[PDB]
Amino acid sequence: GRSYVDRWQSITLAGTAVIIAAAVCVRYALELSSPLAVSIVAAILVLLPAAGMAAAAHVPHTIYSPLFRKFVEWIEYLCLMPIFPLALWLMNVYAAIRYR
Amino acid sequence: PQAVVVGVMAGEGVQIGVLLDANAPVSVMTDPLLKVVNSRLRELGEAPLEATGRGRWALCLVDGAPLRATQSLTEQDVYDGDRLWIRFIADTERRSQVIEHISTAVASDLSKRFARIDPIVAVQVGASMVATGVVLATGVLGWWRWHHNTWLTTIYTAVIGVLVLAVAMLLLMRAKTDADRRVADIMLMSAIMPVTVAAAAAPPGPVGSPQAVLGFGVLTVAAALALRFTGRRLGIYTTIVIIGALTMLAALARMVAATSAVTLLSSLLLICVVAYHAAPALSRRLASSVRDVLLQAERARSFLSGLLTGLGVMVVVCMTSLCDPHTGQRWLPLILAGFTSGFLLLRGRSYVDRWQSITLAGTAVIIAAAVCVRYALELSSPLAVSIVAAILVLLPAAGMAAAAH
Amino acid sequence: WIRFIADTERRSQVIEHISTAVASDLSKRFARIDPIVAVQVGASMVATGV
Amino acid sequence: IYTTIVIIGALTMLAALARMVAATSAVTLLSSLLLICVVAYHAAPALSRRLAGIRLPVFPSATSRWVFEARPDLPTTVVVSGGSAPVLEGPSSVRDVLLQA
Amino acid sequence: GSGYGLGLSTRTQVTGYQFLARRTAMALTRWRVRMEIEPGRRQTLAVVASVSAALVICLGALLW
Amino acid sequence: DAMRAQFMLMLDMLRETAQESADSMDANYRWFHPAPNTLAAAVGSPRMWERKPDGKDLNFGVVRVGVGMTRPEVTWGEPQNMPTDIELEPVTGKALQEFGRYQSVVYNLPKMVSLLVEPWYALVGEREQVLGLMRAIICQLAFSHGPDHVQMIVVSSDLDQWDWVKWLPHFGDSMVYTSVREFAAEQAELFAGRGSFTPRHASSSAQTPTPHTVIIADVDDPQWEYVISAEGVDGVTFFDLTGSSMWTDIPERKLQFDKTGVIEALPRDRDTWMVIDDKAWFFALTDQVSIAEAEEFAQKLAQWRL
């Protein structure tokens, strides 16, 4: 999202990333309903968006060292590298080929 | 018919009544007219009108749009008793600007015509996401209740309510601008939802009539209390107070003793009917010297828009419940819905405000549509759905056609 | 201008003060509904039914 | 709004079509769409350039030397319904850029 | 026309076009041409690395 | 790529410098030659009758005719050590070429004609276009120059078009005629006494006598040949509204109007007014005023005296 400066283009990218978490949390509570599951889901569903407001309010008026800014940049690349190796694993391709 | 009397506005606000020639073209009058308004201001002891650099003098409507300089005052829709404005409009001539290299040119232009994200909007988005988040948490906690009405739901929700409310408390006391107040209001608006289900979840045993009474009670109290101390967001809070109070009475009656739902539904319909008639009176009683008039006018309007809306929610919920297509005289609730729709359709257009008149008009259409859809799903058949679709599509089409043709 | 002055003629000669900025602003900010808008509303209603 | 419809329509058509011509599996159709979307987010700013008709001219100066003193392009005249009196805006080549962007 | 049609081209014309394409792409998303650092390149290379890593594992299974 | 990117960034800073200089020229040209519709409000201001003939004022005898293209005040120096055509890099080669083609002219600036440069200016086109521009010329002259410096005469058959002229003081004397035979008896007796045309310039303006004469020809009388074939007289300037063959035989004195109101003429230098090319080209987009607007402005000006 920070690669886009337009107001609605950046908000849509951030919103899309957040809604994916919310939608998975709900699915995990209705099915396999249990006291621990609902207890854990209910906490995540309020703290996660709360941490977002906290970060949004404090980040614009603080100072960060070049070494930390360079570190947040690399998190994006480290997140892209595993998607393809993991998706093919979920599709069972490596086991399929090894057993022809 | 040779002349018309109209009010002309001049610099900084002096209105002067003048008798103008009804057929000469307007451009012939603007020059001597400027002289006259200046002469009167000079005698009154005020400062005259003056030009600034390059521009021209024009005669315009109160909305600022200028009159066509060549047309007659009778040729334009200007009548005796109307008013006009004399105004200075500056010269717009300036050099054109060109950038040839497409890469730079796209950045330059695209940055001048649209708005980029900023820290002020970032916080409002954050507030909106937490509000949306907590209502999802109370939902799953409130869903578990229908199968396990144990202490977990109330114990877990109570702490959330206190925590959200505590944050809003510090924000409300620290806010300096309307931007800050919207953030706090969104946070406060969200605190009412967890406390409501938290209270209603306290009485044990299978959920129903006895549990419902607490929820609608605390909801009504909290919404009213928030309004009383905050004095903002009148509409949303008022609408909750109405549905809360009315539901509390029905919940109490059903818990104590009620022969049938039809009885309560009919009672609610009658209560709303009298409220629809009393609506403007309620608003009037619930609502340097000039300021006193401005504040009261919008206050009354705010209470009225919410009131008319809340009553609409109750009657649509009640009527859709009453119109069963199998029970008894299947036609009786349908004609009753028709009579109810007619009153709203005929009286809604008498209101002065657009949203109040529009919302009332729309309230009738949804009732007709909802009844039609109910008679389609229940007592389903190929002819029924075919008949329903024809009715459902032509009904609104006819309403539009009556206005468009 | 040359005009006919009947015996019955009397003129107001009275002025009043209010800032034109507020008058023009309030005129647009709140006013009655127009048929131009109703066409959009009607179109939205028929679309909902289909 | 129309562009959004085209994308879900096109990608869903290819999903249903795979399921129609071959049994395969749901997990595979879902995982495949995910990968197509990850690469599509990287193409979006370039794909959006061509759909709007932005063209990038590239050639070795027409196989000729530069003529710095060339006669500039003629400025175009425009009118408005109310503002019936015509006024010239500028070079036709530069006016499109303000719309294309 | 001067540049229209489907005529011949050279290597410098191929890289030259890719430079203008990168420079104009960021102007649509970031609205500035300063291009202090060029992140479009890096975000693309990270995908190519992902695909290559998948192929190495995939081909490694066939050897087994 | 690093070399390419550095060149592009430097080239845009030169763009800002030209754009900054261009803003200064726009304000100055409007401040001396405003649009005709704005002149009515400005009548009372000290900007009226401001122009002086005493040598230093370079705007004397100059009149605004419309808008178009003009050369900015920037002066471009050629790039040293330019690589040969086969050695030029494609991206930077075309960039420096297109940059030179557009940033060398500034668009939508006011265009002008000078009374001190030609014996006459034949206006050729439909009547409405020719008269529209002429009334604009008359009110511009009248607003910027006083009656002690400019005098105007009309010879016309269509007196119904020249009725508004009554109010302007510049048409007075210490004056509209029906034919050359009439004009010859009253006016030509004075003007035929001496001289022939001589193109002037700012410094020379101090020596020519104070009242410059503008004559409007709208009769198509063949009797005009005497003064026209003699190459006029100094202190006079004719505008032919008819398009007669005696006036229309010189391209250096012919203004051609397209159906869209675009005027074409030979290009003239901005600083010396000398003709620079023999082929006609785009000159200005015409501005015009109605008889009502002209009389409205004329009545406003009729209110003032020395």
Author numbering:
A (entry chain D5): 404 to 503
B (entry chain D6): 18 to 304, 344 to 461
C (entry chain D5): 102 to 151
D (entry chain D5): 253 to 353
E (entry chain B5): 10 to 73
F (entry chain C2): 101 to 274, 285 to 416
Study authors write:
Specialized protein transport systems—known as type VII secretion systems (T7SSs)—are central to the virulence of this pathogen, and are also crucial for nutrient and metabolite transport across the mycobacterial cell envelope. Mycobacterium tuberculosis encodes five homologous, but functionally distinct, T7SSs that are designated ESX-1 to ESX-5. These systems translocate a number of effector proteins across the unique and impermeable diderm cell envelope. Here we reconstituted the ESX-5 T7SS of M. tuberculosis H37Rv in M. smegmatis to obtain a structural view of the entire T7SS membrane complex from this human pathogen.
The intact machinery comprises EccB5, EccC5, EccD5, EccE5 and MycP5 with a 6:6:12:6:3 stoichiometry resulting in a 2.32-MDa complex that is anchored in the inner membrane through 165 transmembrane helices (TMHs). The membrane assembly is best described as a trimer of dimers, in which each dimer comprises a single copy of MycP5 and two protomers each of one copy of EccB5, EccC5, EccE5 and two copies of EccD5. We show how the 2.32-MDa ESX-5 assembly, which contains 165 transmembrane helices, is restructured and stabilized as a trimer of dimers by the MycP5 protease. A trimer of MycP5 caps a central periplasmic dome-like chamber that is formed by three EccB5 dimers, with the proteolytic sites of MycP5 facing towards the cavity. At the membrane level, six EccD5-dimer barrels (each of which contains 22 TMHs) together form a circular raft with an inner cavity. Within this raft, inner EccD5 monomers are situated closer to the centre, whereas outer EccD5 monomers face towards the periphery of the membrane complex. Instead, coupling between two neighbouring EccD5 barrels is achieved by the N-terminal loop and α-helix of EccB5 that run parallel to the cytoplasmic side of the inner membrane and engage in interactions with the TMHs of the neighbouring EccD5 barrel in a clockwise manner. We fully resolved the twelve EccC5 TMHs in the intact M. tuberculosis ESX-5 complex; these form three four-TMH bundles, each of which belongs to the EccC5 molecules of one dimer. These bundles are held together by hydrophobic interactions and effectively seal the central space of the membrane complex, which is enclosed by the EccB5 basket. The entrance to the putative EccC5 pore widens on the cytoplasmic side, where the EccC5 stalk domains expand radially. Together, our data suggest that the six EccD5 barrels provide a stable scaffold for assembly of a secretion pore that is confined by the EccB5 TMHs and gated through three EccC5 TMH bundles.
